Amino acid sequence: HQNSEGRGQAADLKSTQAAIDQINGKLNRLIGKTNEKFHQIEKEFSEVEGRIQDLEKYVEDTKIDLWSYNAELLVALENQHTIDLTDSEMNKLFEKTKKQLRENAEDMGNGCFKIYHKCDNACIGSIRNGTYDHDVYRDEALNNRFQ
Amino acid sequence: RIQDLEKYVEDTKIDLWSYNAELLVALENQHTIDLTDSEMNKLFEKTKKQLRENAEDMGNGCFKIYHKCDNACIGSIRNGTYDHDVYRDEALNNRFQ
Amino acid sequence: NSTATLCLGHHAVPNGTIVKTITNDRIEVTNATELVQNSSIGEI
Amino acid sequence: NDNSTATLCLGHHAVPNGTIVKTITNDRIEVTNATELVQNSSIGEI
């Protein structure tokens, strides 16, 4: 923010934590998923056996392909969701702020609000902490809006 | 040898189907959740764009209609026939003072 | 100078059911159906 | 800024040297940080 009292910036733990909470946890679906597999068929061969070896190769091969595709699709999906998740959590933060300001400001379009009254660092905290009552500054702000 | 392979087949099949199953449920659920929320989040927009400038978003998912609204206008919004222009002068004067 | 408030909302139920999605493993929904046949009849 | 106004911006995190990942839309997109899901290497002993 930039008001008459000067400049400054501070984080919002409430929404940021909601982003980490969904990532750390989406990992827990993927990190420890490993499942045991004991004594499968031999995927490697020394001599040439013909029909049986052709099948034993065709099995372990076609298994690998399907899992590789399944893997690629899973990453590309969890990525597209991870990108969309993070964007939404801040895009929510913008709306949560806008609904708080009521008529006392305007969307500049640069991802910033132009608050149309004298705001100290005190009122900035009431926005951040979430206690901003628009009704007091409403009369004060509306006159600045129209000129 | 044969029994080892015949087992390795039907097993590897089951694993691949189960992953496909788990992934399918978790996707159609996450899509179902987003769907139901969006369909209602749309109705709010349908109402706000219908009310024009005769109200304000209170933030709690309710509109504060800044004019006298009888049971007629409530049904007119219910219908989709709410004309903003009639109440505008009445409401617009109340918002700004 | 009389006002009126119009609010919007959605369905809700007391005892729901939990399902698993991409974001979270536990989430309560209104209504859900089972996709796995875990039992059978005793005869063919 | 005029002492009768006030300017409030909100934003998100960023980092200098990030990493490229693949999604559905695009093959290249830079994210803040990421981990590799494929164990490409191993130890020399059993």
Ligand SMILES: *[C@@H]1O[C@H](CO)[C@@H](O[C@@H]2O[C@H](CO)[C@@H](O[C@@H]3O[C@H](CO)[C@@H](O)[C@H](O)[C@@H]3O)[C@H](O)[C@H]2NC(C)=O)[C@H](O)[C@H]1NC(C)=O
């Ligand atoms: C919102 O939509 C509803 C649904 O159509 C409208 O209700 C309808 O209102 C009309 C006019 O009042 C009703 O017709 C009238 O019936 C009375 C019966 O006493 C009759 O005396 C009149 O000559 C006329 O025929 C109509 O019955 C009623 N809907 C139904 C299903 O019966 C309502 O008018 C709409 N909102 C507004 C603000 O108009």
Ligand SMILES: *[C@@H]1O[C@H](CO)[C@@H](O[C@@H]2O[C@H](CO)[C@@H](O[C@@H]3O[C@H](CO)[C@@H](O)[C@H](O)[C@@H]3O)[C@H](O)[C@H]2NC(C)=O)[C@H](O)[C@H]1NC(C)=O
């Ligand atoms: C909650 O979700 C379940 C699952 O979708 C709903 O159960 C389904 O309900 C419908 C209608 O109540 C059932 O259709 C009926 O099927 C019977 C026999 O199959 C048939 O005789 C009827 O004429 C009608 O077609 C459906 O079978 C049933 N189950 C499934 C798996 O779809 C339930 O209705 C939902 N509850 C609410 C309140 O939405």
Ligand SMILES: *[C@@H]1O[C@H](CO)[C@@H](O[C@@H]2O[C@H](CO)[C@@H](O)[C@H](O)[C@H]2NC(C)=O)[C@H](O)[C@H]1NC(C)=O
């Ligand atoms: C990217 O950031 C994450 C944190 O969200 C890192 O995850 C680390 O490793 C495990 C989780 O898998 C935990 O010890 C912590 O959550 C993280 N620790 C630290 C020190 O970051 C992940 O390692 C990071 N990736 C890179 C390449 O730095």
Ligand SMILES: *[C@@H]1O[C@H](CO)[C@@H](O)[C@H](O)[C@H]1NC(C)=O
């Ligand atoms: C908490 O909110 C109060 C107003 O209710 C504010 O004065 C205070 O600065 C806030 N504290 C923070 C943001 O740490």
